[PDB]
Scaffold this active site. Structure first.
Site, PDB file in Angstrom:
ATOM      1  N   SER A 121       0.848   1.378   3.018  1.00  9.85           N
ATOM      2  CA  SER A 121       1.402   2.501   3.798  1.00  9.85           C
ATOM      3  C   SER A 121       2.870   2.809   3.405  1.00  9.85           C
ATOM      4  O   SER A 121       3.286   3.961   3.510  1.00  9.85           O
ATOM      5  CB  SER A 121       1.251   2.231   5.247  1.00  9.85           C
ATOM      6  OG  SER A 121       1.059   3.450   5.927  1.00  9.85           O
ATOM      7  N   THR A 122       3.615   1.807   2.988  1.00  9.17           N
ATOM      8  CA  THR A 122       5.043   1.924   2.604  1.00  9.17           C
ATOM      9  C   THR A 122       5.229   2.910   1.437  1.00  9.17           C
ATOM     10  O   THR A 122       6.417   3.291   1.215  1.00  9.17           O
ATOM     11  CB  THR A 122       5.645   0.546   2.277  1.00  9.17           C
ATOM     12  OG1 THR A 122       5.038   0.031   1.086  1.00  9.17           O
ATOM     13  CG2 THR A 122       5.567  -0.404   3.446  1.00  9.17           C
TER      14      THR A 122
END
Length: 503
Positions: free
Chosen positions: A246-247
Site C-alpha cells: 500500500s505504501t
C-alpha cells in the site's frame, strides 16, 4: 644467517568516524600487544612458568606453544592488552618478550549505531558498515622502516624510516546521533509493546538526501562481538527486501494526476471490493465501499480503486515514476550487502501485473529505497541522491514529479493521516504530517508506515518497518503509525522545525 635487514610496517592511525555534529562513533584507541620472539625465549626457559601465569596460560601448554613455534621470531601473546597491562609483564624482564602500542577501534555509541557504523576485524581493516564502505579513506597508509636483526631476528638497530605512516582521514556521517538515539529507543519500545521480532526505522532529510538515522532491531554491541548471531548483524534497512504494498499507492496516484485524466475529486466505483482479472482476483482490505474519490482510495487503501486508475493510465506511467524515485534501483551508497530489490519492466504490461504494480505487489524494495522515494515526494517531487556522509554542498537532484502533483499528493497523504483517530494514529502534535501505512506478506507480515512532515513544507521523510507484530488488528500497518508519530515529533523538535499546525 649471522644478520638480516628486515622491514617493519608502521601502522597508520585509522580516521575518526563522527556523526554530522562531530560526536565520536568510531575512535582508534591505543592498545599494547605483548608479543614474543620464540627464538629468544628458548634461552630463558626457567622464566616461562612465571610468564605463562602472567598471561594466565597453562604452564605446559605455553611451554608447548614455545617449543612448536620455536623456529619463528614472532608470536602474539596478548593482542588485546591496554597501555599499561604489558608494563607488569615487561617488569618481569623475560628475554624475547615485548610490548608495542597498536590501535583498536572503540565504538562509543555501541549498539545504537552498530549497523550504520559497522566495525573493523582483528587486523583493524573495515569488515561491515561505513568501516568497510570507506575503508580506503579511513585506513591511511602503513609506514615502513628498515631494521638490522641479529641471528634471532631481534632488532639491534633502526637503519632508517623508508616511509612515514599517513593517518587515515576523519569522516563525518549524515547520521544525527540525537535522532539516532530517539529512533533506536522508540523502535525498541514499539517491538516490545507489539510483541515483534525485528524492525527498521530510516529518517532522511528530504532537501539534502542525508540519512539522519538508520536503526535496526535486533542490534549488537560492536565492542563485544563474542556470541553474535547473523540475526543481530543484519542491516535490515539496506538488505531485507519486501513488497511495499500500500505504501507505493502515492506513486501510482502521482502518475494518475500527471496523466491529464484524473483529479482528486474524481470518483471510482470499487464495489464489491473485489475485481476479477482472468484467474487472479484483486481483493480490498475493506470491502464496504462503492464510490470513492481519489483521496478516499488512499484513506480506504482500495486495491481495486488504484487498479482501475492503473488500467486507465497504463502501467508504463507508474513504472516510470517508481523507477525515477529509485524503487528497485541502485542507491549508489555502495554499502556492503546493500540490495537493489526488483522493479519489473515489461514491453506489454499485462492486466494482472498493471494492477499488482499499482498496489505494490509487482516489486520489491528496501526500507532505504522506500524512504528515498518518500523524500522525493516530500521534496516537491525532486529526488536528491542518498548520502550516509554529511552533505555540505547539496547535489542538484532531479525533478521526477511536478511540484504541483507532489503538492496535491502531499495534501492527500495529510488527509490519510487526519482520517485515523484513536491510539493507532500517525498524527504528530503541533504539525501536519502525511503518510501511508501498509503490510508486506512474508500467517506473518511486515507492518509498514512511510511518511513525511511537516506536510505543508516537508523537511523529514521516515519509514518504519515492524516485522511480524502480535497486535492482531485488521489493519497491520497501523501498528507502525504511533512509532512514526513519536519519532517524527522528536526529530522535528531536535531540528528546530517550526510547527505548521498552530491555531
Amino acid at each position: 644467517p649471522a644478520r638480516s635487514v628486515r622491514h617493519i610496517a608502521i601502522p597508520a592511525h585509522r580516521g575518526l568516524i563522527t556523526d554530522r555534529n562531530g560526536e565520536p562513533l568510531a575512535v582508534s584507541t591505543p592498545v599494547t600487544t605483548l608479543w614474543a620472539n620464540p627464538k629468544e625465549l628458548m634461552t630463558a626457559k626457567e622464566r616461562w612458568p612465571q610468564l605463562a601465569a602472567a598471561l594466565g596460560q597453562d604452564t605446559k601448554l605455553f611451554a608447548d606453544r614455545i617449543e612448536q613455534n620455536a623456529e619463528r621470531e614472532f608470536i602474539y601473546l596478548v593482542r588485546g592488552l591496554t597501555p599499561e597491562q604489558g608494563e607488569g609483564v615487561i617488569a618481569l624482564k623475560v628475554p624475547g618478550v615485548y610490548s608495542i602500542e597498536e590501535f583498536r577501534r572503540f565504538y562509543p555509541a555501541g549498539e545504537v549505531v552498530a549497523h550504520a557504523v559497522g566495525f573493523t576485524d582483528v587486523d583493524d581493516r573495515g569488515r561491515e558498515g561505513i568501516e568497510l564502505a570507506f575503508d580506503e579513506w579511513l585506513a591511511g597508509v602503513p609506514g615502513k622502516r628498515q631494521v638490522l636483526k641479529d641471528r634471532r631476528g631481534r632488532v639491534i638497530k633502526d637503519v632508517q624510516v623508508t616511509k612515514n605512516a599517513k593517518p587515515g582521514k576523519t569522516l563525518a556521517l549524515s547520521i544525527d546521533l540525537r535522532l539516532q538515539y530517539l529512533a533506536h529507543r522508540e523502535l525498541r519500545n514499539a517491538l516490545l509493546e507489539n510483541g515483534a521480532k525485528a524492525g527498521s526505522l530510516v529518517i532522511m532529510d528530504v532537501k539534502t538526501g542525508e540519512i539522519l538515522a538508520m536503526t535496526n532491531q535486533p542490534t549488537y554491541n560492536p565492542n563485544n562481538r563474542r556470541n553474535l548471531q547473523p540475526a543481530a548483524m543484519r542491516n535490515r534497512a539496506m538488505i531485507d527486501v519486501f513488497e511495499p504494498g500500500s505504501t507505493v499507492k502515492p506513486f501510482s496516484m502521482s502518475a494518475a494526476l500527471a496523466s491529464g485524466r484524473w483529479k482528486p475529486s474524481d470518483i471510482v466505483d470499487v464495489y464489491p471490493g473485489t475485481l476479477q482479472i482472468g484467474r487472479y482476483t484483486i481483493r480490498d482490505v475493506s470491502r464496504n465501499s462503492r464510490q470513492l474519490d481519489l483521496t478516499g482510495i488512499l484513506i480506504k487503501s482500495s486495491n481495486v480503486g488504484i487498479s482501475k486508475i492503473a488500467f486507465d493510465i497504463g502501467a508504463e506511467s507508474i513504472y516510470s515514476v517508481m523507477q525515477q524515485v529509485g524503487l528497485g534501483q541502485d542507491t549508489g551508497l555502495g554499502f556492503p550487502g546493500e540490495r537493489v530489490g526488483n522493479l519489473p519492466n515489461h514491453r506489454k504490461w499485462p492486466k494482472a501485473e498493471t494492477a499488482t504494480l499499482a498496489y505494490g505487489y509487482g516489486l520489491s524494495v528496501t526500507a532505504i529505497q522506500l524512504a528515498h522515494a518518500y523524500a522525493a515526494l516530500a521534496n516537491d517531487g525532486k529526488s536528491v541522491p542518498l548520502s550516509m556522509t554529511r552533505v555540505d554542498r547539496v547535489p542538484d537532484g532531479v525533478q521526477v514529479i511536478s511540484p504541483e502533483v507532489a503538492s496535491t499528493v502531499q495534501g492527500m497523504l495529510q488527509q490519510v493521516v487526519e482520517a485515523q483517530g484513536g491510539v493507532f494514529r500517525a498524527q504528530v502534535p503541533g504539525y501536519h504530517a502525511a503518510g501511508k501505512s501498509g503490510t508486506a506478506r512474508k500467517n506473518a507480515y511486515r507492518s509498514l508506515f512511510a511518511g513525511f512532515a511537516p506536510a505543508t513544507d516537508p523537511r523529514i521523510a521516515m519509514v518504519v518497518v515492524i516485522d511480524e507484530p502480535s497486535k492482531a488488528g485488521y489493519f497491520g500497518g497501523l501498528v507502525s503509525a504511533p512509532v512514526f508519530s513519536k519519532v517524527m515529533a522528536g526529530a522535528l523538535r531536535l531540528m528546530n522545525v517550526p510547527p505548521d499546525n498552530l491555531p
